[PDB]
Design a protein around this ligand. Structure first.
Ligand SMILES: CCCCCCCCCO[C@@H]1O[C@H](CO)[C@@H](O)[C@H](O)[C@H]1O
Ligand SMILES: CCCCCCCCCO[C@@H]1O[C@H](CO)[C@@H](O)[C@H](O)[C@H]1O
Ligand SMILES: CCCCCCCCCO[C@@H]1O[C@H](CO)[C@@H](O)[C@H](O)[C@H]1O
Ligand SMILES: Cc1ncc(Cc2csc(C=O)c2C)c(N)n1
Length: 177
């Protein structure tokens, strides 16, 4: 049903935003983005389009609540529309049939967090270089900050989605009935 789908999309976007309110800073803009997780789960369970749309709504929530860090129109577009929308790419690893296998869950999480932090890394180069550490070029700087955020976000998403695969595998498989 379309009703069920819209609500799940809506709820997971809201959940992501709500989770984004937890302090998640390790050092500067090195962060653990646990708020990616409801979007990943949404995409993994409902597929690409649902995932893309959940990401969109999450990004729009960040911006209109003042919880987004904005430097320009293009940068906000890149980092709060494209980047969260890109998480939906996880939907390409949706499993429709039991038994749930772990490897597609990890593979789709890895690819989507990577795709997300790839866009932040491009952002870092164009929009954030003024903050590059003493002696660091912009590309190197952005790689470390966003390469490390990506890895820690993926670590976090794995821990949680692994627990879910083992204790609640059906979260990942949509049933009409
Ligand atoms: C697709 C829906 C997304 C639109 C939501 C954008 C949220 C508004 C944030 O913009 C803000 O505008 C203010 C006025 O110029 C500036 O004071 C501030 O610096 C800038 O951050
Ligand atoms: C595609 C996402 C929609 C984004 C809408 C919010 C745009 C917020 C604009 O912020 C402002 O941008 C100016 C240049 O763009 C800067 O000069 C200014 O310092 C900065 O505060
Ligand atoms: C997924 C990535 C996570 C690890 C972060 C890697 C840090 C990037 C370092 O880059 C290199 O540092 C050299 C230091 O000598 C510079 O000279 C060189 O120009 C630059 O390219
Ligand atoms: C060096 C660097 N610093 C800050 C950001 C901005 C950023 C990093 S993760 C994330 C998720 O909301 C945002 C807005 C960046 N891209 N690169």
């Amino acid at each position: 049903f379309n009703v069920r789908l819209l609500t799940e999309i809506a709820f997971m976007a809201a959940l992501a935003f709500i989770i984004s309110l937890i302090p998640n800073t390790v050092y500067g803009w090195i962060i653990v983005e646990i708020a990616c997780i409801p979007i990943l789960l949404l995409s993994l369970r409902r597929g690409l389009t649902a995932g893309l749309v959940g990401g969109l709504i999450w990004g729009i929530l960040s911006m209109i609540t003042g919880h987004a860090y904005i430097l320009s129109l293009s940068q906000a577009f890149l980092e709060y529309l494209v980047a969260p929308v890109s998480l939906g790419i996880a939907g390409l690893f949706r499993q429709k049939t039991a038994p749930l296998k772990l490897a597609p869950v990890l593979l789709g999480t890895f690819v989507a967090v990577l795709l997300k932090y790839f866009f932040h890394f491009i952002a870092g180069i164009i929009f954030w270089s003024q903050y590059a550490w003493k002696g660091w070029g912009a590309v190197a700087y952005s790689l470390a900050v966003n390469g490390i955020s990506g890895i820690l976000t993926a670590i976090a998403a794995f821990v949680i989605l692994i627990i879910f695969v083992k204790k609640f595998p059906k979260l990942f498989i949509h049933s009409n009935y």
